[PDB]
Amino acid sequence: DLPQGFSALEPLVDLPIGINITRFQTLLALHRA
Amino acid sequence: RVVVLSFELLHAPATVCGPKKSTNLVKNKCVNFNFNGLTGTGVLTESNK
Numbered sequence A: 001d002l003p004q005g006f007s008a009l010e011p012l013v014d015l016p017i018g019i020n021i022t023r024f025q026t027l028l029a030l031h032r033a
Numbered sequence B: 001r002v003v004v005l006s007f008e009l010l011h012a013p014a015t016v017c018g019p020k021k022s023t024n025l026v027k028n029k030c031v032n033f034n035f036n037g038l039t040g041t042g043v044l045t046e047s048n049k
Helices: none
Strands: B031-035 B038-042
Touching: none
Parallel strands: none
Antiparallel strands: B031 B038
């Protein structure tokens, strides 16, 4: 539920990895959204 | 025990690195300063911002 309002995103981390990123995904935690 | 350290530059971006030095700061005096690579000349004063 993205509400109506204004908020700024203060920088958290920057890292000099220096590789190419072309795709992305996410992962979940389950032990046998 | 002697180690031959290698400082190598290759076809890789220089993204990853390091640095340092420190003299007691003066105040209320026309001086030229170097703050972490930001260089200038002026008078430094205590501020409430």
